[PDB]
Amino acid sequence: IVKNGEKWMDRYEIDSLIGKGSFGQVVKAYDRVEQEWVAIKIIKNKKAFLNQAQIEVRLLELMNKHDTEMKYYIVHLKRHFMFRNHLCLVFEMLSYNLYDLLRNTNFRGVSLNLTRKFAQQMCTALLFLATPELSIIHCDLKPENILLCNPKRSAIKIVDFGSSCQLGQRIYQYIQSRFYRSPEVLLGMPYDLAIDMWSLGCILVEMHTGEPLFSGANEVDQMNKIVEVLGIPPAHILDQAPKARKFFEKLPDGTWNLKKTKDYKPPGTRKLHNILGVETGGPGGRRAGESGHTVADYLKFKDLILRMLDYDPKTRIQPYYALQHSFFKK
Ligand SMILES: COc1ccc(-c2ccnc(N)c2)cc1
Ligand SMILES: [Cl-]
């Protein structure tokens, strides 16, 4: 319960509720010292949420100490303080999220050209998080966690480092939102920064088609929707996976296949080529003839996405090399 007009610490005047989370709530507030509006993320007064939010504060302050071009795709933490036994994180105000943007297209998607602008900003963010001394895994990339800087413009920033961890500081095996969950996490394997790049691949297809690429209703369904597009994962990965046998069965000759329950397209037959409509006027044919939606434009996009959706986290494309892809050229 926070009321409009409520004044905190002779500094902040609470205006309105921006959003609610598992973590607590985010409110619009006026800062009298800086003379500007800010977003205040108010964590619930329960050990679990406080402790995870203390990790979010540490990771944001760690990024803020690195002044470089690439850090300006991450929402700015201005400060944090403790009030009425709630940890409170003060951020810059951003605009609406990319799910809202998709809802506003009635889930028909934005252009290849706006998708490219989002791709390039998000690839730069991931390059920043991969800075050795940072090595931050977001762990929850999805459209909802990508906000416009300004409702008139196509600049974006990532929010919500509530799930985030540094490489080698993993807490939970079960992480990421199901639609954006990487194969290595579905398979219960130790995960690295490559799980964010998997999420990003999923996100960019969704931004252009308007619908999630892999909309599993549970982990079994999720892996089955991935297999439809990408085929059976390579044996070398499945051999090292604790949860391989949640989804696949090993045969003595001809190593792995799907476990079948009661009655999906055959492995690797739901081609990304058709989902994108590379040769058939884009998703549902709705970009037929539009500029920036040529077959050559489409093939570049398909190639970058399939590199982002490599099953092998060690060969999956990394941010620097994604930024050099032809999809971003001239
Ligand atoms: C509208 O402005 C904002 C700014 C930050 C956030 C934010 C920041 C960090 N975590 C979450 N879940 C949300 C939301 C809206
Ligand atoms: Cl979504």
Ligand SMILES: [Cl-]
């Ligand atoms: Cl998570």
